Symmetry: C4
Subunit: 200 residues, 4 copies
């Protein structure tokens, strides 16, 4: 009886309301905060075509100038940010907006990014979203970028989907909106360090 | 001498008989039951184009409202259901119907889904099947959905393929049909718990 | 000075001589024999378009009727045969013929296939080769099949490529040809068993 | 305030200056040298279309004649060179030139390639770069090759990107340029051997 998101035949019961306007779109900011027990870098992606995006896939690169231990200066090195290639979660079912998650762990290049170290670091998260417009079979690409000052430590995205009368409504007025939530200041590596300290 | 499924040249010796009618199709229900020693979520997919589906690939998302440990309400979170991305089994050779299998294990979001817990949970399995119609090079997508009341604990699919005179016949009258088979009521996690109990 | 296979600009110095004739092609048989220390199932694939095959990828399914431990009869179950999806070796650079290799190990469904057990088993290896004809952007698929009597235990493929005067020549008269080589009769599982026996 | 590589809308602020000329291009040579603590095989790839390359992906094969332990002569065997398929780093964001890296480790076929052993070995690195020209949806492939004498032990690529006034400039006069840097002569396997020697 309760309303389903997708009908047996494939039709999605989503409505798009309160309308990067009218294509694929990305939240203005990214955030870092606690989810399911882990420090997570998050941003939001949306689809306002009314074609389905077939084989939708997202990837993320961290762009940064750095110096290698050997002393070489790399003016704009690209490091991978895992956003699903490890589970298949990077192959998106994107009809309503999703919060893409990068879990910060020992393999993440943000492993030792703390709230304080962020005020000093310079980096750029580059997001790449590719898919096939079912309408024409054409492959398209959209991108965005987050600089260090567009990543908000201790913020959480508001929800944009609600249940109302036989469809799931998406409130695009809340697409970019975040709020502050209590969040440790430490990097995951520091958090890790401070446990292999205070452990019996 | 015995009849082969595929001839040396590539031609499949399948016949489609007793005919989601005339496209790609999905069983009406999914089931959960024991196969090869493991509790498995199963559903059936078919192909009634007479184009071959080139690069056919299936994925599955569990859609559910939940609350994170941090107390955030996620109105429609998407979790991955592994249906092969770990072995390449998600790249289907789909001429006759297949029973797609999700092995329920510690990584599955259904790890603690028991027959009793199912009467209370609300979830939606979303299935996405993509391929290229060889005929035109166009990429298509078909989908379906299983709600908690369309997943049948302790059911098994009937077989739809038989051998008859120089071809393998597919009986589409049995495509959706299941039957009850004796199956433990417990979740895999409970099954696991009850062994690290009663073990010398 | 010595002749290279591929020039700096991308042009391949292969010549095709002594000519599944004039498309993609597959050896008539597969073999099983020792390579680099492991029992390997091998077959040969060729490309006689004169388009390059872009994003060429091969997969292999074992088709077999079997009975599950729970006593269910599966009339035509599909098991994966790893032919590279673990290293990226399944994304082929296919200008001259290649010997595709399935290493028989504990994960292979042929793990306990011995020369004697082969005289009794019924199975069908199905091979699927997909790529994009660069010429038109169209995605094509070719297939073949090996039954149990078309898999030759203790055979080895002859080489089809030689060096001659500024190009690498492919001798298509030897494409299907194999010869017998001395090869243990035992399955890999038996080989494994017989070492955890005779071990100090 | 500081200039970003990619604008919020996706537009890249790269300029291409001092101009394999006018397509996709590859450095003339590859090098092997120390980066981030590891012996790395490196080469450079560029994109001078002014279409974006959508779903850009690179792979690398080592082509070599060798003899298997069983005594078979393989006139032109293909071994995989990992250039990212393990992290997703093989799916390139290629607007300015990148230095593609193959980390030499125990799985690399170059695991025991030393500077001295290189003067004797014969091999060919084959590079394959595929993508979709966004302009037309057509899939293209470019290739190059490095023979043993085109791989420079103890060389490092110069940087080709600099910051200048509201855009990142690419100096194509330095695209092929390398210089010598101090680098151990030993293979990684020898380096490894010489540590499990001189270890308390």
């Amino acid at each position: 009886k309760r309303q389903r998101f997708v009908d047996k035949n494939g039709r999605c019961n989503v409505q798009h309301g309160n309308l990067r306007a009218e294509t694929l779109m990305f939240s203005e900011h990214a955030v870092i905060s606690m989810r399911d027990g882990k420090l997570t870098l998050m941003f939001r992606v949306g689809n306002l075509r009314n074609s389905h995006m077939v084989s939708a896939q997202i990837r993320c690169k961290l762009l940064k100038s750095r110096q290698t231990p050997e002393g070489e200066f790399l003016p704009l090195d690209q490091l991978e940010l895992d956003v699903g290639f490890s589970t298949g979660a990077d192959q998106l079912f994107l009809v309503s907006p999703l919060t893409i998650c990068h879990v910060i762990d020992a393999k993440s290049p943000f492993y030792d990014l703390s709230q304080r170290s962020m005020q000093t670091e310079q980096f750029e998260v580059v997001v790449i979203l590719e898919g096939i417009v079912e309408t024409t079979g054409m492959t398209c690409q959209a991108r965005t970028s987050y600089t260090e000052d567009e990543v908000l430590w201790g913020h959480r995205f508001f929800p944009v989907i609600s249940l109302e009368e036989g469809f799931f409504k998406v409130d695009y007025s809340q697409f970019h909106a975040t709020f502050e939530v209590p969040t440790p200041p430490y990097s995951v590596k520091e958090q890790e360090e401070m446990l292999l300290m205070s452990s019996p």
